[PDB]
């Protein structure tokens, strides 16, 4: 016997998914009551709501073996249940798709595209995804009608191919494209920050060499390397993760402190060219006051912001990877055996339960990758 095992699996999975999603949604609401609400909160909350939809529509009917034994009831009940199941599946896929699109928007081209965003837990992409999930699952009202309930129907193979293409292959390919684009952008930002760090390092090393230099050369020299490093550094604009507008600190406060820095380098070079090495040493010390004012804080801020966006992108990538690895085993079976296909694919429940494990584990992934929810140890 294996029906009891399936029932126990479904019961524990419902418990886990419902509890985790409810706890994370409650933490989101609590943090919203404070001044710690963020744009990503709507996306995570609606992904949680899609997970609850999966739990209550796609998992509850199967768990109840006194109601899914023969799907007793009027055809309206079965039609509604199947429509809700497909809506939940579409929503679970497309909320992750929307999250990845949000990452692409807020990393590749972080503009003021959060129009009509609100703390009421809704925005344009998520409502678009929900509406698309509702529309694309409409065909489910014209298939299942009190057949025990069964499909009423080339129709089956074509429909299953369409479902796997719309729910899994197309969203997954879009997500993969967005992820490769985001990876490229993040690598570009990392390389730019590494270049700025290297320029700062060259500045510091040549300052040390000037401090320990004892002749005209190594001062006239090692100031040219500093000047080249400063010229290269002031050109490096902040990554797309931060805005670039006039009066911004990064436009004036950064490339004005660098102007004073290069001016002091020029003064040191002017002194060195006259043989006044001792005088040129004083400019070396003078340069530190400008070095530690405009640039060190900018480097710290850039590193911290890059780390934060990298953490969010890693969270999204983990969610996507779990999504694919948990849903592909189920969709592939249908795709391979829905054509009447080499044989009959007897195992059905376990694959769908494994798929729902993804919805079970999303809230844990978010909490692990989120400091706001991680600090919510005491409830």
């Amino acid at each position: 016997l294996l029906a009891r095992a399936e029932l126990a699996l479904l019961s524990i999975v419902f418990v886990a998914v419902a509890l985790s999603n409810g706890l994370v949604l409650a933490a989101l609401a609590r943090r919203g009551r404070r001044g710690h609400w963020a744009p990503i909160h709507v996306f995570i909350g609606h992904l949680c709501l899609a997970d609850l939809a999966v739990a209550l529509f796609q998992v509850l009917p199967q768990l109840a073996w006194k109601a899914t034994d023969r799907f007793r009831g009027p055809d309206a009940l079965c039609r509604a249940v199947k429509y809700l199941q497909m809506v939940g599946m579409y929503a679970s896929s497309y909320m992750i798709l929307a999250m990845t699109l949000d990452r692409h928007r807020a990393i590749c081209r972080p503009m003021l595209a959060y129009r009509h965003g609100s703390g009421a837990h809704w925005n344009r992409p998520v409502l678009v995804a929900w509406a698309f999930s509702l529309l694309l699952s409409l065909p489910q009202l014209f298939i299942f009608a009190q057949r025990d309930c069964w499909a009423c129907f080339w129709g089956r193979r074509t429909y299953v191919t369409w479902i796997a293409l719309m729910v899994f292959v197309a969203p997954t390919l879009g997500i993969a494209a967005c992820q490769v684009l985001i990876f490229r952008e993040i690598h570009a930002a990392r390389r730019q920050l590494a270049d700025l760090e290297d320029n700062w390092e060259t500045l510091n090393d040549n300052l040390k060499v000037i401090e320990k230099a004892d002749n005209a050369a190594q001062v006239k020299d090692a100031l040219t390397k500093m000047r080249a490093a400063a010229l290269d550094a002031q050109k490096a604009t902040p990554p797309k993760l931060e805005d670039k507008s006039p009066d911004s600190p990064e436009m004036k406060d950064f490339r004005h402190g660098f102007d004073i820095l290069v001016g002091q380098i020029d003064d040191a070079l002017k002194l060195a060219n006259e043989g006044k090495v001792k005088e040129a040493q004083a400019a070396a010390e003078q340069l530190k006051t400008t070095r530690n004012a405009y640039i060190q804080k900018y480097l710290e801020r850039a590193r911290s912001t890059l780390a934060a966006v990298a953490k969010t992108v890693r969270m999204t990538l983990v969610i996507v990877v779990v999504y694919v690895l948990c849903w592909a085993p189920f969709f592939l079976v249908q795709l391979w055996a829905a054509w009447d296909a080499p044989l009959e694919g007897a195992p059905f429940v376990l694959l769908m339960l494994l798929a729902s494990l993804n919805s079970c584990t999303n809230p844990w992934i978010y909490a692990s990758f989120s400091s706001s929810v991680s600090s919510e140890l005491r409830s």
Partner: antibody
Amino acid sequence: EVQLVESGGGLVQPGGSLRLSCAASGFNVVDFSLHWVRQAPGKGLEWVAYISSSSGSTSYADSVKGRFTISADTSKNTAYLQMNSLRAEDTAVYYCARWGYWPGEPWWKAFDYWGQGTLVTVSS
Amino acid sequence: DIQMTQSPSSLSASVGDRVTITCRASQSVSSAVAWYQQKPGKAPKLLIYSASSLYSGVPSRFSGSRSGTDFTLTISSLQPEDFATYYCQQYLYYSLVTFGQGTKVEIKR
């Protein structure tokens, strides 16, 4: 309109002395550093000297240091280059170029208004 | 003492032909590199005033580019009046300006 005009080039025996005057019109030498760049007959350009009138910060190339003297007169808005102890390879066409100051874009525009160039030949 | 070697000592091309000239610097100067054009008996003419920045009055066919320590000047549609020597200067500091040896572009036949 901006224009540099060179004068003073001519024939001087080796070991003699010469003076090259670069006159600027359309701008003040105080706002720009005036460089002297010489090109030998059938050869590439090479930088000879420069003067910054605001700071009085002269400079010279390793092959002319100690023999060339670059000065500037803002009243006449001209730059003078006095060449002494001339040698055989000092023969060339000397252009007077103009270079902005660091703070802004005028610096990032390298020599952008050259002069006509004056030819000096030294031979026995 | 920053060398500015210009590899193509001379180059032959025909009208409508893309021509590329390269320059390499001993140290790592910044985008402080300019490209000039000199015709026989005339003072140079600032074509590119940064690593890649067209001057005000230069035709748009000229285009400069930089990659690390290697700079390049490219002419897409070589016109009959694009035949002239081309020089590559590094101008990191007032007393550190050095030119290249120059490439003479000639007509093909």
